[PDB]
Design a protein around this ligand. Structure first.
Ligand SMILES: Nc1ncnc2c1ncn2[C@@H]1O[C@H](COP(=O)(O)O)[C@@H](O)[C@H]1O
Length: 315
């Protein structure tokens, strides 16, 4: 059961003098909220321990918490905890298996079941929610949550659920958010910093909004070629990140972005209903029923994708 695993995690954390926490490369709010929220619980609870959070900062999330630089030596005999990383190959700072122990905490399917102690709960909204849950048990072992830690966990939850929009939001998620918002951090300032968007990514989004084609069957497309990328000064990853912004257009059922890179065209599939991971598979990609991707090599293939998207949507 989960109750037995949370208790073992807390017992194990108790034992180690030095604890170092990692999360995934290209961190998002949930990576910061889980890794740093837990770091901050442990610092507040165990002033005697040496606690570090490692990885390269994301400049847009750098306002939540600052990270540590640590020597290889520091790992000797350390407990290493990795948050919110489904695949060990995607862990930021690849020193994670070099301590005396390895603990994995994640909310994604346990396809890569690494670690000496594993707690993976796919029912959880986010790993930040999992950290709050662990704190609730830890409370009975003397754990203490301060204002910074509450703020971090709240940022993670709010980030990962699109502010209680997405289907990973549950009754627990909202309950815990109401407990967290009782701490005296400014929710409005947090939101303001999390949602701050570079002007040129804004302008690119406006190009995307003006240039979206919607068929009578609810199929939509946006082409983002090198010329457009260059005009707005936006990277291809910035463009791809905007794929979710079409979600509310009236009548939209499924859609694709085609984002040109140097050695491939990235394809990002999104849907309101009709399953699109087969379509991504058909073109050598894959992913979730409602969010998938592929990589193609000509504009001719893109037109084939479109055609297939019209068909799927029309059924
Ligand atoms: N080329 C690809 N091959 C396989 N899976 C992919 C590919 N691109 C995206 N995905 C998956 O599709 C889902 C949506 O991610 P993405 O659209 O890349 O942001 C995730 O589960 C990705 O791992």
């Amino acid at each position: 059961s989960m109750a037995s695993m949370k208790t073992e995690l807390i017992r194990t954390i108790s034992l180690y003098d030095t604890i170092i926490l990692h999360r995934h490369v290209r961190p998002d709010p949930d990576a910061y909220g889980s890794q740093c929220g837990l770091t901050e619980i442990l610092r507040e609870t165990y002033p005697e321990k040496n606690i570090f959070a490692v990885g390269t900062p994301e400049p847009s999330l750098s306002f939540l918490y600052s990270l540590d630089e640590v020597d290889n030596e520091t790992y000797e005999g350390a407990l290493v905890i990795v948050c919110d990383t489904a695949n060990q190959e995607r862990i930021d700072d690849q020193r994670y298996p070099s301590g005396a122990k390895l603990m994995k905490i994640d909310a994604h399917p346990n396809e890569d079941p690494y670690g000496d102690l594993l707690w993976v709960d796919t029912s959880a909204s986010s790993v930040s929610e999992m950290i709050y849950e662990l704190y609730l048990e830890g409370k009975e072992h003397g754990w203490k949550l301060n204002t910074k830690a509450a703020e971090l966990i709240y940022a993670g939850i709010v980030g990962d659920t699109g502010r209680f929009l997405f289907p990973n939001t549950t009754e627990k998620t909202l309950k815990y958010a109401g407990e967290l918002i009782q701490y005296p951090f400014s929710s409005s300032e947090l939101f303001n910093q999390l949602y701050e968007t570079k002007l040129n990514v804004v302008k690119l989004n406006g190009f995307i909004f003006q240039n979206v084609s919607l068929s009578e069957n609810g199929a939509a497309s946006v082409f983002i070629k090198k010329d457009t990328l260059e005009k707005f000064g936006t990277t291809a990853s910035e463009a791809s990140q905007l794929v979710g912004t079409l979600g509310n257009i009236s009548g939209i059922r499924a859609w694709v972005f085609f984002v040109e890179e140097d050695d491939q065209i990235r394809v990002r599939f999104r849907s309101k209903g009709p399953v699109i991971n087969g379509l991504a598979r058909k073109y050598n990609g894959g992913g979730h029923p409602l969010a998938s991707g592929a990589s193609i090599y000509s504009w001719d293939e893109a037109d084939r994708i479109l055609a297939d998207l019209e068909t799927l949507c029309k059924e």
